[PDB]
Amino acid sequence: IVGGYTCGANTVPYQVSLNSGYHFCGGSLINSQWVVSAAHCYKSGIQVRLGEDNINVVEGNEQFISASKSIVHPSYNSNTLNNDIMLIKLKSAASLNSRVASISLPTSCASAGTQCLISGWGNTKSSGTSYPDVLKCLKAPILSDSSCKSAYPGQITSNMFCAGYLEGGKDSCQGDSGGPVVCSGKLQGIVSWGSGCAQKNKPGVYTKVCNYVSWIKQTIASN
Numbered sequence: 001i002v003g004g005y006t007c008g009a010n011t012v013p014y015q016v017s018l019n020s021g022y023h024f025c026g027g028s029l030i031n032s033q034w035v036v037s038a039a040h041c042y043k044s045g046i047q048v049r050l051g052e053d054n055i056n057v058v059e060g061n062e063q064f065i066s067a068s069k070s071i072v073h074p075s076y077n078s079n080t081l082n083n084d085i086m087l088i089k090l091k092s093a094a095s096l097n098s099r100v101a102s103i104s105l106p107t108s109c110a111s112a113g114t115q116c117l118i119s120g121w122g123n124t125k126s127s128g129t130s131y132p133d134v135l136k137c138l139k140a141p142i143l144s145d146s147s148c149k150s151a152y153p154g155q156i157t158s159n160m161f162c163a164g165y166l167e168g169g170k171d172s173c174q175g176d177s178g179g180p181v182v183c184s185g186k187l188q189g190i191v192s193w194g195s196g197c198a199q200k201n202k203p204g205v206y207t208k209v210c211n212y213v214s215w216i217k218q219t220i221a222s223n
């Protein structure tokens with residue numbers, strides 16, 4: 001997250017870190033057994049880390065649970081990033097409390113102008129590289145579909161939306177991939193892609209979660 005703020009420990013209780021010997025992506029806990037992340041975060045041997053603040057220090061509220069199964073969206077295209085969503089099942093159910101909690105799925109899509117919270121452990125620099133140890137947060141509005149398409153000609157599908165600031169300086173970035181965009185207590189987006197980070201006229205692009213609620217619910221019901 002570039003141009004954000006320190007969230008505070010366990011203030012984003014649905015935020016998870018996906019770990020394969022090291023943090024490599026974010027994700028969102030949607031019930032005691034399931035995490036939603038980006039399909040471009042797929043790999044084998046995932047351990048899901050819940051209740052994290054400093055990802056390099058055991059602070060007392062962590063739950064580390066190995067993934068038993070990953071399900072990449074059936075229509076994920078890794079070239080275009082269309083349908084950039086994946087579900088990860090935990091080998092054992094998480095213990096839910098104030099610091100480890102699921103986030104609600106949307107019942108309808110959000111609108112341009114809605115304020116959301118984007119979070120992650122990704123790069124905090126727009127030019128260089130600096131990875132934080134503690135969770136970073138950014139409040140950002142959803143941008144109009146027209147401005148999103150104008151920013152990224154030929155690239156924005158109906159399964160994507162832009163959020164952030166056209167002026168630059170505030171954005172998600174590398175390492176935030178797969179993490180949450182939460183608006184009014186609903187998971188509306190997943191950190192997906194963008195041109196660099198926090199660049200003028202290049203806002204963040206996010207997977208449009210509301211399009212996937214039916215798939216998420218039916219997948220969970222049978223897996």
Ligand SMILES: N=C(N)c1ccc(C=O)cc1
Pocket residue numbers: 171172173174175176177191192193194195196197198203204205
């Ligand atoms: N919001 C961005 N600019 C952004 C999001 C994800 C990636 C993935 O590496 C890169 C850039």
Ligand SMILES: [Ca+2]
Pocket residue numbers: 052053054055056057058059062
């Ligand atoms: Ca920790």
